[PDB]
């Protein structure tokens, strides 16, 4: 049912996604559980993650938008700010949250991590040390995850 | 075979983005593999053509070594000149001559620090000029390879 | 066909076939870079060792030019001593190999090199050439990325999927 202030807003976010979905972004709450979202970011151009089909999983809380959601990459990843299980070390998801952030705002903020990773939090120590000194080998390794992302048939995006 | 832009994407629209992307990645690898076989043959050709050219020097050095063993005095050097003369595998001989070139030139003639410096400088002067020529050649032939594919795109219909 | 040739032609191909084709080229490219790296390594290791022998003939030529008498032979040693093209130098040595040994032994005694300027001239040239080789190889390294970028961006510019997802 959809009377809870949190659930009420999550449907408000969903409407925006259905009408002004950011470029290279997909997001759909589970048809029954409106607290778990399937998401999919496409790596922007002129970034080593270019043309990747990276799947995300957004888990929300009853306090939203006052509390950030849990965000996990589902596709395999190689990013300085992505832990080995998919959990993203993003600022707006940790200590710089805000109720003016809907789903789109969070998926584009994760999208922007592709072009410029935050060097402050090395979740992936290898990815961080590659991106800072050996950039040519960095792009070589990022593209191997871009290739893997294509394997999934995007069944999570059907109706 | 796609859908409307100002709309959320579809399972069909992303499968079509993956296939078109899989091809572009396929093509990027295909062009990288073809450029390398052209360089690999020119490398394997030039690698054989360089080993063939040493036989002029090696044969001329062995005869010059044999000419002086009868008048050579130091037995560790006499044994060394013999070791040089009696090596049949030419790969061994070329390094034995390259690695011990300073010892060789002195033993044939019978200042010494000048020889070590002119041999170090001449070998490097020769090595670098050839290495630069092949690098400039690898650069010249590679630019031609890619611009062939570029021209087929700049006019394709 | 086994492998598709155009971006238009891939809509009919299933994904499992496109992946099988991509890997065959990706794996062929990795074997070829290893082959290209190890080959270019062995080509430099051989040019240093061929120059080892070649230089020893040049050094013996420089040592005996002062006591050679007939100038048609001195011109031959001079032509030999001052060339830096190994194909040129190796032909000169292969074609006249016995003559060289004759001129080396014909000289009565070992005679001292008279010019340190050629060693400084080579020292400066040695440094200039090392600088030119690195810059030439760098011109090639950045170009491989540069040309592969423009070729790939032509496929992107003509793509229907890319223009749908990102173009505003």
Author numbering:
A (entry chain A): 0 to 158
B (entry chain C): 12 to 121, 127 to 173
C (entry chain D): 16 to 183
Task: Provide text from the study.
We screened through several fungal species and were able to crystallize the Kluyveromyces lactis Rad6 (KlRad6) in complex with the Kluyveromyces lactis Bre1 (KlBre1) N-terminal fragment 1-206 or 1-184 (crystal forms 1 and 2, respectively). The structures were refined to resolutions of 3.2 and 3.05 Å. The complexes in both crystal forms adopt similar conformations, except for complex 1 in crystal form 2. The orientation of KlRad6 in this complex is related to the orientation of KlRad6 in other complexes by a rotation of 14°. KlRad6 in this complex forms extensive interactions with neighboring protein molecules in the crystal, which may play a role in stabilizing the observed structure. In contrast, KlRad6 molecules in the other three complexes do not mediate extensive crystal packing interactions. When the three KlRad6 molecules not mediating extensive crystal packing interactions in our structures are compared, large structural differences are observed for residues 90–98 and 115–121 surrounding KlRad6’s active site. The 90–98 region can be resolved in the electron density map in crystal form 1 but is mostly disordered in KlRad6 molecule 2 in crystal form 2, the equivalent Cα atoms in the 115–121 region are located as far as 5.2 Å apart. In contrast, in KlRad6 molecule 1 in crystal form 2, the temperature factors for these regions are not elevated, consistent with stabilization of their structure by the extensive crystal packing interactions.
The mono-ubiquitination of the histone protein H2B (H2Bub1) is a highly conserved histone post-translational modification that plays critical roles in many fundamental processes. In the budding yeast, the H2Bub1 reaction is catalyzed by the E3 enzyme Bre1 together with the E2 enzyme Rad6. In addition to the RING domain, Bre1 contains a N-terminal Rad6-binding domain (RBD) that also makes important contributions to the H2Bub1 catalysis. We found that the interaction stimulates Rad6’s enzymatic activity by allosterically increasing its active site accessibility and likely contribute to the H2Bub1 catalysis through additional mechanisms.
